[PDB]
Amino acid sequence: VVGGTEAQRNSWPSQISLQYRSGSSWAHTCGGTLIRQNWVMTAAHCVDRELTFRVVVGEHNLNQNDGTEQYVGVQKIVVHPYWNTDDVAAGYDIALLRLAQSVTLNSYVQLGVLPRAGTILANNSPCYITGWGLTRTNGQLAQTLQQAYLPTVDYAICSSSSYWGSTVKNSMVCAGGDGVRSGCQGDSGGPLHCLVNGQYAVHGVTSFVSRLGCNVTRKPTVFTRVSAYISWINNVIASN
Numbered sequence: 080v081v082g083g084t085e086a087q088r089n090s091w092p093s094q095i096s097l098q099y100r101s102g103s104s105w106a107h108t109c110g111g112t113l114i115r116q117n118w119v120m121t122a123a124h125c126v127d128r129e130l131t132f133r134v135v136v137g138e139h140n141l142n143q144n145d146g147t148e149q150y151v152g153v154q155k156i157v158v159h160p161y162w163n164t165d166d167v168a169a170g171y172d173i174a175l176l177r178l179a180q181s182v183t184l185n186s187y188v189q190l191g192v193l194p195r196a197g198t199i200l201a202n203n204s205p206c207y208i209t210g211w212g213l214t215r216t217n218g219q220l221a222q223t224l225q226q227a228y229l230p231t232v233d234y235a236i237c238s239s240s241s242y243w244g245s246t247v248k249n250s251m252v253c254a255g256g257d258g259v260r261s262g263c264q265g266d267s268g269g270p271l272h273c274l275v276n277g278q279y280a281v282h283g284v285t286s287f288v289s290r291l292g293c294n295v296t297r298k299p300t301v302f303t304r305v306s307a308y309i310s311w312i313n314n315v316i317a318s319n
């Protein structure tokens with residue numbers, strides 16, 4: 080997250096860190112959202128590589144003992160069947176991870192609430208992106224979980240020529256684009272939390288930013304629209 084602030088440790092208890100094994104250690108690669116005690120929602124592109132993955136819930140600082148973490152292996156990966164890694168613009172950037180164990184819920188570890196199917200946010204709706212992604216274009220991962228206020232940019236504006244044009248689909252949510260705040264590499268897969276009727280829900284799964292840079296004016300961060308995938312999510316969980 081470029082232009083973020085450090086999240087309070089109990090603000091976003093559904094955020095997870097998706098990590099891969101690298102040598103004798105683990106490296107953060109993506110975010111995700113805990114949606115069942117044994118299921119995480121993330122981006123398909125986060126699991127393109129044939130890596131050993133684990134999830135950390137209750138994570139705040141990637142580099143220090145928080146005293147709240149639960150570390151759990153990924154047991155099964157279900158990528159959306161229409162995902163194509165060389166066509167992120169097509170959409171379908173979503174995957175579910177079944178965890179090896181069911182995590183224990185507490186103020187640091189909660190299920191993310193998803194929107195009702197079909198819900199589309201009005202332009203300029205209030206949301207926060209969260210994650211440990213780079214803090215500057217071509218920078219480094221955050222140590223502490225970051226949040227940034229990224230209002231939505233509706234489909235009509237986001238798909239206009241000076242924004243994303245044809246690259247954005249109605250199955251996506253755009254947010255931000257102010258040239259200051261954005262997602263960045265390592266935020267992928269994590270939530271866009273939007274406040275509606277007094278409650279935050281996870282309306283987005285972070286999918287992509289401009290190839291030119293993270294915080295580029297009129298290139299809002301682009302998310303998979305969770306509310307387009309409610310049936311898909313429910314079907315996967317019911318069949319697994």
Ligand SMILES: [Ca+2]
Nearest residue numbers: 140143144145
């Ligand atoms: Ca930690």
